[PDB]
C-alpha cells in the first residue's frame, strides 16, 4: 500500500515520543 | 654511496602518487612525490603529475649510482602506468614488475559509504 | 563440461598432507579455484577447500604467494 498511512502513523508516534521526553521528569515526580 | 641495483616503490592513491627508490635492504635513498613537483590539490591526482614525480625520482636515484631497478606497484590505478613508463623513459632500467597491494582477508570495518 | 575427478572410480582421497593434489587446484596466486572452472561436485569442492585451508594452517601452502 501507499506509504501515506505509514507517514501519518510515524508522525503520531514521533509526537507522542517527544511529549514523553518533555514530561518524563514531571511524570516521575507525580508518579 | 653507490648502489648499482635497487627497488622502486610506487604508491598511487586516488589523490596522490609517491615514488621512492630504495636500497634493497629497504632504505629509501631518493623519493619524489606528486605534490613535490609543483602540484597541489586535485591536480596532483592526474597521471601527468605521476609522470613528473617518477621522472624526478628517477633522476634523484640516477645521480646516486642506481642503474637497474625493479618496481613494486601499489594502490588503486591512477598513474601507475605512466609511473612505470616514466621510470623507464628517464634512463632507469626496469628489472621486474610486482603488484604488491595490501589485501586484507576481510579484516577491520571499512568507513561508511559516501553519498 | 569438465569432470569431477573424485566421483570417478579412480578418485583419489582428499587429504591435507598430499600437497601436489592441492597445488593442482589453486591458482598461481595461491587462491582457491572456483567450482565451475574445476567442475568437481559440491562435496568434493568443499573437501578441497577444507584441505587447502588446513594445509595453509600447517605451513604447506603459501598464503597468497
Amino acid at each position: 500500500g501507499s506509504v501515506i498511512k505509514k507517514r501519518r502513523k510515524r508522525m503520531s508516534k514521533k509526537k507522542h515520543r517527544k511529549l514523553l521526553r518533555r514530561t518524563r521528569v514531571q511524570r516521575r515526580k507525580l508518579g | 654511496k653507490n648502489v648499482p641495483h635497487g627497488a622502486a616503490h610506487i604508491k598511487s592513491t586516488f589523490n596522490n602518487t609517491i615514488v621512492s627508490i630504495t636500497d634493497p635492504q629497504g632504505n629509501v635513498i631518493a623519493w619524489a612525490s606528486s605534490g613535490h613537483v609543483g602540484f597541489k590539490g586535485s591536480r596532483k591526482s592526474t597521471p601527468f603529475a605521476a609522470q613528473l614525480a617518477a621522472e624526478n625520482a628517477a633522476r634523484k636515484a640516477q645521480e646516486h649510482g642506481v642503474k637497474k631497478v625493479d618496481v613494486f606497484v601499489k594502490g588503486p590505478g591512477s598513474g601507475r602506468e605512466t609511473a612505470i613508463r616514466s621510470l623507464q623513459a628517464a634512463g632507469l632500467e626496469v628489472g621486474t614488475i610486482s603488484d604488491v597491494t595490501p589485501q586484507p582477508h576481510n579484516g577491520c570495518r571499512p568507513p561508511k559509504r559516501r553519498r | 563440461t569438465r569432470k569431477c575427478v573424485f566421483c570417478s572410480k579412480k578418485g583419489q582421497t582428499i587429504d591435507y598432507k598430499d600437497t601436489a593434489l592441492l597445488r593442482t587446484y589453486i591458482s598461481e596466486r595461491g587462491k582457491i579455484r572456483a567450482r565451475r572452472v574445476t567442475g568437481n561436485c559440491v562435496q568434493h569442492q568443499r573437501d578441497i577447500a577444507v584441505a587447502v585451508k588446513n594445509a595453509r594452517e600447517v605451513a604447506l601452502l603459501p598464503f597468497g604467494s
Binding site: - | - | 598432507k17 588446513n54 600447517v58 605451513a59 601452502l61 603459501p62 598464503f63
Partner: protein, 96 residues
C-alpha cells in the same frame, strides 16, 4: 578409544638423530594410559611456507595414535608446553 593423527613441526636446530627417541618418550604417557597403539613417521628438515617463531626450516613428524580423547588432549598440552616443538595439529582419522 578413537584414532588420531598428530602432525608436529619442531625447530631445525636440534639434531634429527634425537627426534625419534625423544618423541618416543613424549608418547610414553599415552602408551601407559589405556593400552594404546602408535605409528611414528618422520619426514623433517623441510622449509616452511611462512616463517614460524623466527624459523624457516622445520622437522615434520606424523604420529598415528589410538587413544582416549582426554589422553590425546593431555599429550597435546605437554607437546605445546615443550620449547622444542614449534607447532602441533591434531586431526581425527575417523569420519570427522
Amino acid at each position: 578409544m578413537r584414532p588420531y593423527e598428530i602432525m608436529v613441526i619442531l625447530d631445525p636446530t636440534l639434531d634429527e638423530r634425537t627426534v625419534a627417541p625423544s618423541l618416543e618418550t613424549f608418547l610414553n604417557v599415552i602408551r601407559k594410559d589405556g593400552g594404546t597403539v602408535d605409528k611414528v613417521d618422520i619426514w623433517g628438515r623441510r622449509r616452511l611456507a611462512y616463517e614460524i617463531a623466527k624459523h624457516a626450516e622445520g622437522i615434520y613428524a606424523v604420529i598415528d595414535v589410538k587413544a582416549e580423547p582426554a589422553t590425546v588432549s593431555e599429550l597435546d598440552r605437554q607437546l605445546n608446553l615443550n620449547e622444542s616443538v614449534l607447532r602441533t595439529k591434531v586431526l581425527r582419522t575417523d569420519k570427522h
